[PDB]
Design an enzyme around this catalytic site. Structure first.
Site: not given
Lengths: 50, 148, 49
Positions: B14, B49, B57
């Site tokens: 995280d 594209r 997280g």
């Protein structure tokens, strides 16, 4: 598939999706060796053609 | 055993924990994201594209941010600075097409696990894909998942 | 392509834990070769090909 694992079984399911990862990057040794030889053969085949 | 002796180590991908500049696992997790986006980038560019990377997280936008820098992302979604519920889609479009105008053919968006709008509504990578698709771009979601 | 898939599965296997399941969504519209070979190489529980 996720809901079956989360609801029919008690499993915390985390999905991993490759997407464009599966088309990107350099060719693996087998692909390099084989694509190269195929290129060589394709030329010969095209020339030997009647 | 009257006085507890307790010490804490931050083992977290995280990087949410306060007081520490980085937590154990954060850079490694970031490396896994980079590993994947590097494959996406390692193809000869195509004309229309787009790519969406759903990064993990739950409580902190650090991974999303750092991935943004590390991969040269067009747009990122982080809980710390969320966009308006009213015009995030229109701002996404602006940013992307601006870069596309300047030469960019590898449009990349990074969506954090905890991605939201300023009205606390979550922003799914599918939501983001739909935005880019209506801009005429063939969009592909890549969910890192447990890989991170 | 098979290599990219297995690289992800390998990273998934490289961890601990009960009540955990993992889904690897594989690209390959017509054939099940990638699914079958990834499943074989990474000893997956169930493949949907």
């Amino acid at each position: 598939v996720k809901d079956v694992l989360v609801n029919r079984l008690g499993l915390d399911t985390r999905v991993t999706t490759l997407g464009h990862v599966q088309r990107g990057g350099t060719a693996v040794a087998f692909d390099r060796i084989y694509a190269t030889l195929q290129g060589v053969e394709a030329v010969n085949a095209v020339l030997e053609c009647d | 055993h009257r006085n507890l002796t307790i010490v804490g180590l931050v083992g977290s991908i995280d990087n949410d924990m306060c007081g520490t500049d980085s937590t154990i696992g954060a850079y490694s997790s970031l490396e896994r994201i980079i590993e994947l986006v590097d494959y996406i980038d390692a193809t000869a560019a195509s004309h229309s594209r787009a790519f969406v990377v759903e990064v993990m997280g739950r409580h902190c936008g650090w991974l999303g941010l750092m991935s943004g820098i590390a991969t040269g992302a067009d747009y990122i979604f982080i809980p710390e600075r969320p966009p308006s519920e009213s015009n995030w889609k229109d701002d996404l479009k602006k940013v992307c097409l601006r870069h596309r105008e300047k030469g960019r053919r590898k449009t990349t968006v990074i969506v954090a696990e905890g991605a939201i709008d300023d009205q606390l509504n979550p922003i799914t990578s599918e939501e983001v894909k739909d935005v880019l698709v209506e801009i005429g771009l063939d969009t592909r979601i890549t969910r890192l998942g447990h890989v991170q | 392509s098979l290599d990219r898939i297995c690289r992800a599965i390998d990273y998934i296997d490289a961890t601990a834990s009960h009540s955990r399941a993992f889904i690897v969504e594989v690209m390959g519209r017509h054939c099940g070769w990638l699914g079958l070979l990834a499943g074989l190489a990474t000893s997956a529980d169930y493949i949907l090909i």
